[PDB]
């Protein structure tokens, strides 16, 4: 096995950034009077 973890970390960071961005959109919806 090629003991390299770059694609795995990349997809994990992508999913995490997506979820965090959705939560900042939730703040955007709230704080926008």
């Amino acid at each position: 096995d090629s003991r390299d973890y770059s694609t795995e970390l990349s997809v994990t960071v992508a999913v995490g950034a997506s979820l965090l961005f959705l939560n900042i959109l939730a703040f955007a919806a709230l704080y926008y009077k």
Binding site: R3, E8, V15, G16, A26, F27
Partner: protein, 193 residues
């Protein structure tokens, strides 16, 4: 204006619940899956380990990954720091599941009070997940971990091994929990208006 106000509050509450369930799934996955740290090209032996479970290769140019560890039996956990981290990551999971249970209180109890109850249960969950992430690196001196990663490994030092998806997913879970906690606080104060 008020009907738009109520519609936005309701929708954002629904999305907050959805993201709470997503974070609960993340917490369960990181607690269970043993992919917090893993071998590298320069490592002596192959394998990986999580909070309590660890799998190591015998060292014969094959997989043959002998696997040992279980949270039910605290004897098999390599070190005390691992035990403490596994406890905190569980207390965090039991506290996020408690909020998902407390969603049922929205029928009867005042909505602001329930929002704040989950705000405080999510804040504590993030604090536990943060204490669990700070304490887990302290057990990297354990001889079992040192045997796989190598001599260079130590307390608060990766050495030759590299972090795998579970660790960064737990960090993302910390951030998500904190953001959801503030979201719940703002929603709870927003229903009162």
């Amino acid at each position: 204006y008020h009907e738009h106000y109520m519609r936005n509050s309701r929708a954002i509450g629904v999305l907050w619940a959805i993201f709470t369930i997503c974070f609960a799934i993340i917490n369960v996955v990181v607690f269970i899956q043993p992919y917090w740290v893993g071998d590298s090209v320069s490592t002596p032996k192959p394998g990986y380990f999580g909070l309590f479970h660890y799998c190591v290769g015998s060292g014969l140019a094959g997989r043959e990954l002998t696997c040992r560890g279980s949270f039910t039996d605290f004897s098999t956990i390599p070190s005390s720091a691992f035990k403490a981290a596994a406890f905190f990551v569980l207390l965090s999971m039991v506290l996020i599941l408690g909020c998902i249970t407390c969603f049922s209180l929205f029928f009867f109890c005042n909505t602001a009070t329930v929002y704040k109850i989950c705000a405080w249960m999510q804040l504590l969950a993030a604090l536990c997940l943060v204490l669990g992430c700070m304490i887990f690196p302290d057990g990297w001196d354990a001889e079992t971990i040192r045997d796989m990663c190598g001599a260079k490994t130590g307390k608060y030092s990766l050495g030759d091994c590299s972090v795998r998806w579970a660790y960064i997913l737990a960090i993302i879970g910390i951030l998500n929990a904190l953001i959801l906690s503030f979201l719940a606080f703002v929603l709870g104060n927003r229903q009162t208006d």
